[PDB]
Amino acid sequence: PTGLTGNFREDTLALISSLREAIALPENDPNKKAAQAEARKKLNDFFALYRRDDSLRSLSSFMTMQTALNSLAGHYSSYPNRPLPEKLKARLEQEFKQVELALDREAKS
Ligand SMILES: [Cl-]
């Protein structure tokens, strides 16, 4: 139902890939709105599962992903009928890259 595995690294990497795909679609793609609606659902599902785990809450990967996912959610809530500005898309992408770096640093610690 969620598609979440319960493995924080696998799920975060999969969510990053899903979000990258949704954001990369052209504004005029027929499926853009649907992909958006699914991004919202998936980020909500991800927080619903993982925010209850205070181990994960202490980690940089988690903190940065929360910053990202909040910025995405906030755009929709404030500007539901406008596209993500290029400047936000660029920031989200930097954040994703940072999450991935943090996941690898955490795994080798
Ligand atoms: Cl709007």
Side-chain angles (χ1 to χ4, degrees), residues 85-99:
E86 294 309 308
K87 282 182 179 170
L88 185 50
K89 292 187 207 158
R91 186 181 291 156
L92 289 164
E93 182 60 26
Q94 294 175 346
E95 288 168 333
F96 295 157
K97 277 185 265 198
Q98 295 165 20
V99 167

mmCIF file with all atom_site columns, all heavy atoms in Angstrom, residues 85-99:
data_model
loop_
_atom_site.group_PDB
_atom_site.id
_atom_site.type_symbol
_atom_site.label_atom_id
_atom_site.label_alt_id
_atom_site.label_comp_id
_atom_site.label_asym_id
_atom_site.label_entity_id
_atom_site.label_seq_id
_atom_site.pdbx_PDB_ins_code
_atom_site.Cartn_x
_atom_site.Cartn_y
_atom_site.Cartn_z
_atom_site.occupancy
_atom_site.B_iso_or_equiv
_atom_site.pdbx_formal_charge
_atom_site.auth_seq_id
_atom_site.auth_comp_id
_atom_site.auth_asym_id
_atom_site.auth_atom_id
_atom_site.pdbx_PDB_model_num
ATOM 1   N N   . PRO A 1 85 ? 9.371  26.729 -8.717  1.00 0.00 ? 85 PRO A N   1
ATOM 2   C CA  . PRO A 1 85 ? 10.325 27.579 -9.371  1.00 0.00 ? 85 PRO A CA  1
ATOM 3   C C   . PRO A 1 85 ? 11.683 26.881 -9.551  1.00 0.00 ? 85 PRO A C   1
ATOM 4   O O   . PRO A 1 85 ? 12.093 26.054 -8.749  1.00 0.00 ? 85 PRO A O   1
ATOM 5   C CB  . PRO A 1 85 ? 10.445 28.805 -8.438  1.00 0.00 ? 85 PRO A CB  1
ATOM 6   C CG  . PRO A 1 85 ? 9.579  28.614 -7.331  1.00 0.00 ? 85 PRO A CG  1
ATOM 7   C CD  . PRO A 1 85 ? 8.926  27.231 -7.413  1.00 0.00 ? 85 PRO A CD  1
ATOM 8   N N   . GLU A 1 86 ? 12.376 27.247 -10.603 1.00 0.00 ? 86 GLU A N   1
ATOM 9   C CA  . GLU A 1 86 ? 13.691 26.681 -10.889 1.00 0.00 ? 86 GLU A CA  1
ATOM 10  C C   . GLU A 1 86 ? 14.617 26.760 -9.692  1.00 0.00 ? 86 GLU A C   1
ATOM 11  O O   . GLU A 1 86 ? 15.422 25.835 -9.471  1.00 0.00 ? 86 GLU A O   1
ATOM 12  C CB  . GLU A 1 86 ? 14.340 27.385 -12.076 1.00 0.00 ? 86 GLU A CB  1
ATOM 13  C CG  . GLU A 1 86 ? 13.594 27.142 -13.413 1.00 0.00 ? 86 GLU A CG  1
ATOM 14  C CD  . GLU A 1 86 ? 13.339 25.646 -13.700 1.00 0.00 ? 86 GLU A CD  1
ATOM 15  O OE1 . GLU A 1 86 ? 14.329 24.853 -13.635 1.00 0.00 ? 86 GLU A OE1 1
ATOM 16  O OE2 . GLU A 1 86 ? 12.149 25.286 -13.969 1.00 0.00 ? 86 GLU A OE2 1
ATOM 17  N N   . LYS A 1 87 ? 14.536 27.837 -8.919  1.00 0.00 ? 87 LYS A N   1
ATOM 18  C CA  . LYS A 1 87 ? 15.436 28.036 -7.795  1.00 0.00 ? 87 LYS A CA  1
ATOM 19  C C   . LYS A 1 87 ? 15.165 27.033 -6.650  1.00 0.00 ? 87 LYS A C   1
ATOM 20  O O   . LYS A 1 87 ? 16.105 26.550 -6.001  1.00 0.00 ? 87 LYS A O   1
ATOM 21  C CB  . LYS A 1 87 ? 15.436 29.445 -7.291  1.00 0.00 ? 87 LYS A CB  1
ATOM 22  C CG  . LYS A 1 87 ? 16.250 30.241 -8.202  1.00 0.00 ? 87 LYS A CG  1
ATOM 23  C CD  . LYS A 1 87 ? 16.362 31.615 -7.789  1.00 0.00 ? 87 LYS A CD  1
ATOM 24  C CE  . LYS A 1 87 ? 17.240 32.361 -8.769  1.00 0.00 ? 87 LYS A CE  1
ATOM 25  N NZ  . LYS A 1 87 ? 17.105 33.804 -8.401  1.00 0.00 ? 87 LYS A NZ  1
ATOM 26  N N   . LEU A 1 88 ? 13.888 26.695 -6.476  1.00 0.00 ? 88 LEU A N   1
ATOM 27  C CA  . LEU A 1 88 ? 13.526 25.661 -5.498  1.00 0.00 ? 88 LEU A CA  1
ATOM 28  C C   . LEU A 1 88 ? 13.949 24.292 -5.993  1.00 0.00 ? 88 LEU A C   1
ATOM 29  O O   . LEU A 1 88 ? 14.524 23.504 -5.248  1.00 0.00 ? 88 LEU A O   1
ATOM 30  C CB  . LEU A 1 88 ? 12.035 25.728 -5.223  1.00 0.00 ? 88 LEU A CB  1
ATOM 31  C CG  . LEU A 1 88 ? 11.522 24.808 -4.138  1.00 0.00 ? 88 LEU A CG  1
ATOM 32  C CD1 . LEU A 1 88 ? 12.340 24.953 -2.900  1.00 0.00 ? 88 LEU A CD1 1
ATOM 33  C CD2 . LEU A 1 88 ? 10.033 25.111 -3.908  1.00 0.00 ? 88 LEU A CD2 1
ATOM 34  N N   . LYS A 1 89 ? 13.739 24.039 -7.277  1.00 0.00 ? 89 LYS A N   1
ATOM 35  C CA  . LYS A 1 89 ? 14.145 22.730 -7.864  1.00 0.00 ? 89 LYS A CA  1
ATOM 36  C C   . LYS A 1 89 ? 15.662 22.546 -7.669  1.00 0.00 ? 89 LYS A C   1
ATOM 37  O O   . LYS A 1 89 ? 16.167 21.479 -7.258  1.00 0.00 ? 89 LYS A O   1
ATOM 38  C CB  . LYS A 1 89 ? 13.727 22.660 -9.328  1.00 0.00 ? 89 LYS A CB  1
ATOM 39  C CG  . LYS A 1 89 ? 12.269 22.611 -9.617  1.00 0.00 ? 89 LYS A CG  1
ATOM 40  C CD  . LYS A 1 89 ? 12.085 22.376 -11.065 1.00 0.00 ? 89 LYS A CD  1
ATOM 41  C CE  . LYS A 1 89 ? 10.828 22.876 -11.664 1.00 0.00 ? 89 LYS A CE  1
ATOM 42  N NZ  . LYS A 1 89 ? 11.095 23.039 -13.157 1.00 0.00 ? 89 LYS A NZ  1
ATOM 43  N N   . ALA A 1 90 ? 16.440 23.589 -7.949  1.00 0.00 ? 90 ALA A N   1
ATOM 44  C CA  . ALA A 1 90 ? 17.858 23.509 -7.744  1.00 0.00 ? 90 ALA A CA  1
ATOM 45  C C   . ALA A 1 90 ? 18.231 23.221 -6.277  1.00 0.00 ? 90 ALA A C   1
ATOM 46  O O   . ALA A 1 90 ? 19.104 22.380 -6.025  1.00 0.00 ? 90 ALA A O   1
ATOM 47  C CB  . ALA A 1 90 ? 18.515 24.794 -8.239  1.00 0.00 ? 90 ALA A CB  1
ATOM 48  N N   . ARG A 1 91 ? 17.606 23.882 -5.343  1.00 0.00 ? 91 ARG A N   1
ATOM 49  C CA  . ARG A 1 91 ? 17.849 23.636 -3.906  1.00 0.00 ? 91 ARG A CA  1
ATOM 50  C C   . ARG A 1 91 ? 17.464 22.207 -3.501  1.00 0.00 ? 91 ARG A C   1
ATOM 51  O O   . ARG A 1 91 ? 18.230 21.507 -2.809  1.00 0.00 ? 91 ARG A O   1
ATOM 52  C CB  . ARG A 1 91 ? 17.089 24.615 -3.044  1.00 0.00 ? 91 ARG A CB  1
ATOM 53  C CG  . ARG A 1 91 ? 17.461 24.442 -1.561  1.00 0.00 ? 91 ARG A CG  1
ATOM 54  C CD  . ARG A 1 91 ? 16.689 25.413 -0.690  1.00 0.00 ? 91 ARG A CD  1
ATOM 55  N NE  . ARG A 1 91 ? 17.173 26.758 -0.957  1.00 0.00 ? 91 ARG A NE  1
ATOM 56  C CZ  . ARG A 1 91 ? 16.489 27.885 -0.760  1.00 0.00 ? 91 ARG A CZ  1
ATOM 57  N NH1 . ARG A 1 91 ? 15.247 27.859 -0.262  1.00 0.00 ? 91 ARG A NH1 1
ATOM 58  N NH2 . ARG A 1 91 ? 17.060 29.059 -1.075  1.00 0.00 ? 91 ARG A NH2 1
ATOM 59  N N   . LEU A 1 92 ? 16.298 21.787 -3.936  1.00 0.00 ? 92 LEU A N   1
ATOM 60  C CA  . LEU A 1 92 ? 15.900 20.376 -3.670  1.00 0.00 ? 92 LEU A CA  1
ATOM 61  C C   . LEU A 1 92 ? 16.921 19.355 -4.160  1.00 0.00 ? 92 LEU A C   1
ATOM 62  O O   . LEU A 1 92 ? 17.282 18.367 -3.424  1.00 0.00 ? 92 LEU A O   1
ATOM 63  C CB  . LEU A 1 92 ? 14.532 20.059 -4.281  1.00 0.00 ? 92 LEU A CB  1
ATOM 64  C CG  . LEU A 1 92 ? 13.328 20.704 -3.624  1.00 0.00 ? 92 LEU A CG  1
ATOM 65  C CD1 . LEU A 1 92 ? 12.089 20.618 -4.572  1.00 0.00 ? 92 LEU A CD1 1
ATOM 66  C CD2 . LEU A 1 92 ? 13.053 20.024 -2.214  1.00 0.00 ? 92 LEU A CD2 1
ATOM 67  N N   . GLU A 1 93 ? 17.443 19.555 -5.352  1.00 0.00 ? 93 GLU A N   1
ATOM 68  C CA  . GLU A 1 93 ? 18.432 18.680 -5.882  1.00 0.00 ? 93 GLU A CA  1
ATOM 69  C C   . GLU A 1 93 ? 19.712 18.673 -5.054  1.00 0.00 ? 93 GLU A C   1
ATOM 70  O O   . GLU A 1 93 ? 20.267 17.620 -4.761  1.00 0.00 ? 93 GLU A O   1
ATOM 71  C CB  . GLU A 1 93 ? 18.624 18.978 -7.365  1.00 0.00 ? 93 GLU A CB  1
ATOM 72  C CG  . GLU A 1 93 ? 19.568 18.124 -7.978  1.00 0.00 ? 93 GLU A CG  1
ATOM 73  C CD  . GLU A 1 93 ? 19.238 16.621 -7.919  1.00 0.00 ? 93 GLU A CD  1
ATOM 74  O OE1 . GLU A 1 93 ? 18.059 16.143 -7.812  1.00 0.00 ? 93 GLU A OE1 1
ATOM 75  O OE2 . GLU A 1 93 ? 20.198 15.848 -8.032  1.00 0.00 ? 93 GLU A OE2 1
ATOM 76  N N   . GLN A 1 94 ? 20.167 19.828 -4.564  1.00 0.00 ? 94 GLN A N   1
ATOM 77  C CA  . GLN A 1 94 ? 21.348 19.895 -3.677  1.00 0.00 ? 94 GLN A CA  1
ATOM 78  C C   . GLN A 1 94 ? 21.120 19.127 -2.398  1.00 0.00 ? 94 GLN A C   1
ATOM 79  O O   . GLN A 1 94 ? 21.992 18.366 -1.978  1.00 0.00 ? 94 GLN A O   1
ATOM 80  C CB  . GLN A 1 94 ? 21.670 21.349 -3.353  1.00 0.00 ? 94 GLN A CB  1
ATOM 81  C CG  . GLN A 1 94 ? 22.129 22.204 -4.571  1.00 0.00 ? 94 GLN A CG  1
ATOM 82  C CD  . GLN A 1 94 ? 22.336 23.719 -4.248  1.00 0.00 ? 94 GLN A CD  1
ATOM 83  O OE1 . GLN A 1 94 ? 21.907 24.214 -3.188  1.00 0.00 ? 94 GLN A OE1 1
ATOM 84  N NE2 . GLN A 1 94 ? 22.977 24.453 -5.178  1.00 0.00 ? 94 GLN A NE2 1
ATOM 85  N N   . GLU A 1 95 ? 19.942 19.313 -1.861  1.00 0.00 ? 95 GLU A N   1
ATOM 86  C CA  . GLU A 1 95 ? 19.473 18.595 -0.628  1.00 0.00 ? 95 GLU A CA  1
ATOM 87  C C   . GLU A 1 95 ? 19.450 17.124 -0.813  1.00 0.00 ? 95 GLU A C   1
ATOM 88  O O   . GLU A 1 95 ? 19.940 16.395 0.026   1.00 0.00 ? 95 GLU A O   1
ATOM 89  C CB  . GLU A 1 95 ? 18.099 19.139 -0.168  1.00 0.00 ? 95 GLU A CB  1
ATOM 90  C CG  . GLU A 1 95 ? 18.230 20.524 0.435   1.00 0.00 ? 95 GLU A CG  1
ATOM 91  C CD  . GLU A 1 95 ? 16.947 21.216 0.645   1.00 0.00 ? 95 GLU A CD  1
ATOM 92  O OE1 . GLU A 1 95 ? 15.935 20.952 -0.072  1.00 0.00 ? 95 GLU A OE1 1
ATOM 93  O OE2 . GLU A 1 95 ? 16.973 22.180 1.414   1.00 0.00 ? 95 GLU A OE2 1
ATOM 94  N N   . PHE A 1 96 ? 18.905 16.663 -1.921  1.00 0.00 ? 96 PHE A N   1
ATOM 95  C CA  . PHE A 1 96 ? 18.888 15.189 -2.248  1.00 0.00 ? 96 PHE A CA  1
ATOM 96  C C   . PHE A 1 96 ? 20.310 14.655 -2.264  1.00 0.00 ? 96 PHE A C   1
ATOM 97  O O   . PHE A 1 96 ? 20.590 13.552 -1.807  1.00 0.00 ? 96 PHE A O   1
ATOM 98  C CB  . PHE A 1 96 ? 18.166 14.911 -3.537  1.00 0.00 ? 96 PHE A CB  1
ATOM 99  C CG  . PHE A 1 96 ? 16.677 15.235 -3.529  1.00 0.00 ? 96 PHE A CG  1
ATOM 100 C CD1 . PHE A 1 96 ? 15.999 15.490 -4.755  1.00 0.00 ? 96 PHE A CD1 1
ATOM 101 C CD2 . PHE A 1 96 ? 15.903 15.230 -2.362  1.00 0.00 ? 96 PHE A CD2 1
ATOM 102 C CE1 . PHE A 1 96 ? 14.674 15.803 -4.766  1.00 0.00 ? 96 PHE A CE1 1
ATOM 103 C CE2 . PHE A 1 96 ? 14.536 15.580 -2.423  1.00 0.00 ? 96 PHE A CE2 1
ATOM 104 C CZ  . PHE A 1 96 ? 13.942 15.806 -3.594  1.00 0.00 ? 96 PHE A CZ  1
ATOM 105 N N   . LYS A 1 97 ? 21.193 15.349 -2.979  1.00 0.00 ? 97 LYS A N   1
ATOM 106 C CA  . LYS A 1 97 ? 22.570 14.938 -3.044  1.00 0.00 ? 97 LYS A CA  1
ATOM 107 C C   . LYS A 1 97 ? 23.201 14.871 -1.644  1.00 0.00 ? 97 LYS A C   1
ATOM 108 O O   . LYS A 1 97 ? 23.910 13.905 -1.280  1.00 0.00 ? 97 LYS A O   1
ATOM 109 C CB  . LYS A 1 97 ? 23.335 15.889 -3.981  1.00 0.00 ? 97 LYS A CB  1
ATOM 110 C CG  . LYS A 1 97 ? 23.145 15.467 -5.386  1.00 0.00 ? 97 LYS A CG  1
ATOM 111 C CD  . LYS A 1 97 ? 23.981 16.312 -6.296  1.00 0.00 ? 97 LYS A CD  1
ATOM 112 C CE  . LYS A 1 97 ? 23.227 17.449 -6.866  1.00 0.00 ? 97 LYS A CE  1
ATOM 113 N NZ  . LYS A 1 97 ? 24.016 17.918 -8.064  1.00 0.00 ? 97 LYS A NZ  1
ATOM 114 N N   . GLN A 1 98 ? 22.879 15.843 -0.818  1.00 0.00 ? 98 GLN A N   1
ATOM 115 C CA  . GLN A 1 98 ? 23.365 15.847 0.544   1.00 0.00 ? 98 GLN A CA  1
ATOM 116 C C   . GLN A 1 98 ? 22.845 14.676 1.356   1.00 0.00 ? 98 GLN A C   1
ATOM 117 O O   . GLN A 1 98 ? 23.591 14.132 2.156   1.00 0.00 ? 98 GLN A O   1
ATOM 118 C CB  . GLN A 1 98 ? 23.032 17.141 1.236   1.00 0.00 ? 98 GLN A CB  1
ATOM 119 C CG  . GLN A 1 98 ? 23.708 18.342 0.657   1.00 0.00 ? 98 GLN A CG  1
ATOM 120 C CD  . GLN A 1 98 ? 23.092 19.646 1.117   1.00 0.00 ? 98 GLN A CD  1
ATOM 121 O OE1 . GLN A 1 98 ? 22.391 19.697 2.166   1.00 0.00 ? 98 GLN A OE1 1
ATOM 122 N NE2 . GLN A 1 98 ? 23.315 20.714 0.326   1.00 0.00 ? 98 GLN A NE2 1
ATOM 123 N N   . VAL A 1 99 ? 21.579 14.313 1.130   1.00 0.00 ? 99 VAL A N   1
ATOM 124 C CA  . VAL A 1 99 ? 20.980 13.169 1.885   1.00 0.00 ? 99 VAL A CA  1
ATOM 125 C C   . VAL A 1 99 ? 21.796 11.948 1.505   1.00 0.00 ? 99 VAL A C   1
ATOM 126 O O   . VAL A 1 99 ? 22.159 11.091 2.357   1.00 0.00 ? 99 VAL A O   1
ATOM 127 C CB  . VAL A 1 99 ? 19.524 13.008 1.552   1.00 0.00 ? 99 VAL A CB  1
ATOM 128 C CG1 . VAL A 1 99 ? 18.980 11.631 2.075   1.00 0.00 ? 99 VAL A CG1 1
ATOM 129 C CG2 . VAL A 1 99 ? 18.728 14.215 2.202   1.00 0.00 ? 99 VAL A CG2 1
#
